[PDB]
Write a protein that holds these residues in place. Structure first.
Motif, PDB file in Angstrom:
ATOM      1  N   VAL A 158      40.112  46.081  44.521  1.00 20.99           N
ATOM      2  CA  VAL A 158      40.363  46.740  43.243  1.00 20.99           C
ATOM      3  C   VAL A 158      41.870  46.923  43.114  1.00 20.99           C
ATOM      4  O   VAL A 158      42.496  47.566  43.967  1.00 20.99           O
ATOM      5  N   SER A 159      42.449  46.352  42.062  1.00 25.45           N
ATOM      6  CA  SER A 159      43.880  46.460  41.797  1.00 25.45           C
ATOM      7  C   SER A 159      44.080  47.470  40.674  1.00 25.45           C
ATOM      8  O   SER A 159      43.653  47.238  39.538  1.00 25.45           O
ATOM      9  N   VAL A 160      44.732  48.585  40.990  1.00 25.79           N
ATOM     10  CA  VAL A 160      44.887  49.704  40.065  1.00 25.79           C
ATOM     11  C   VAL A 160      46.319  49.723  39.552  1.00 25.79           C
ATOM     12  O   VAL A 160      47.269  49.822  40.339  1.00 25.79           O
TER      13      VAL A 160
ATOM     14  N   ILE B 245      46.290  48.775  45.690  1.00 26.41           N
ATOM     15  CA  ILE B 245      45.232  47.860  46.095  1.00 26.41           C
ATOM     16  C   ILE B 245      44.225  48.632  46.937  1.00 26.41           C
ATOM     17  O   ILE B 245      44.565  49.146  48.010  1.00 26.41           O
ATOM     18  N   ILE B 246      42.988  48.720  46.456  1.00 28.05           N
ATOM     19  CA  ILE B 246      41.901  49.375  47.174  1.00 28.05           C
ATOM     20  C   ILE B 246      40.908  48.303  47.593  1.00 28.05           C
ATOM     21  O   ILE B 246      40.411  47.545  46.751  1.00 28.05           O
ATOM     22  N   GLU B 247      40.620  48.233  48.890  1.00 28.81           N
ATOM     23  CA  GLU B 247      39.665  47.267  49.410  1.00 28.81           C
ATOM     24  C   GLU B 247      38.867  47.897  50.543  1.00 28.81           C
ATOM     25  O   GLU B 247      39.245  48.932  51.098  1.00 28.81           O
TER      26      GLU B 247
ATOM     27  N   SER C 118      51.039  46.773  46.198  1.00 31.70           N
ATOM     28  CA  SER C 118      51.415  45.388  45.969  1.00 31.70           C
ATOM     29  C   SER C 118      52.900  45.297  45.622  1.00 31.70           C
ATOM     30  O   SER C 118      53.518  46.295  45.242  1.00 31.70           O
ATOM     31  N   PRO C 119      53.501  44.108  45.753  1.00 27.76           N
ATOM     32  CA  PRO C 119      54.921  43.968  45.384  1.00 27.76           C
ATOM     33  C   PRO C 119      55.214  44.360  43.948  1.00 27.76           C
ATOM     34  O   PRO C 119      56.322  44.826  43.654  1.00 27.76           O
TER      35      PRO C 119
END
Lengths: 74, 74
Positions: A4-6, A71-73, A65-66
């Motif tokens: 999940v990219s927040v 990033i939730i995983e 992230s850059p």
């Protein structure tokens, strides 16, 4: 993998918090400031993420992230 | 004029709420969904806006810009 990219928008990384318990992950942010003459003096957000039904409790990986995404995983 | 343009991002207009009392305006949003297999099942945000010190209480104007911005003004 499951990811999940927040997009936290204008919230600074030091203002974020990740909280996980029993297959749920909650990411939130909190920002405050002065604005003696008015304006937005505080703001916050909350997102509840349901993890896949097979992961163990308190089993999560978070990182920035850059581009500044949270990033939730599993 | 005095104006605050709020980017509500992916929150639908029907999910927003504007609350004003005693020279403060709080805009918020609330979204929930199903995601039986996981994902973001709910999210919300809150922004506290301090009005100029000369406006009367419960005196505010809100509207939706053509781009979907929430416009808060005296």
């Amino acid at each position: 993998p499951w990811k999940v990219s927040v997009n936290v928008h204008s919230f600074k990384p030091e203002e974020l918090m990740v909280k996980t318990k029993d297959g749920y992950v909650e990411v939130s942010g909190k920002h405050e400031e002065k604005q003696q003459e008015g304006g937005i003096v505080s703001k916050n957000f909350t997102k509840k993420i349901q993890l896949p039904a097979e992961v163990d409790p308190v089993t999560v990986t978070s990182s920035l992230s850059p581009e500044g995404l949270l990033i939730i995983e599993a």
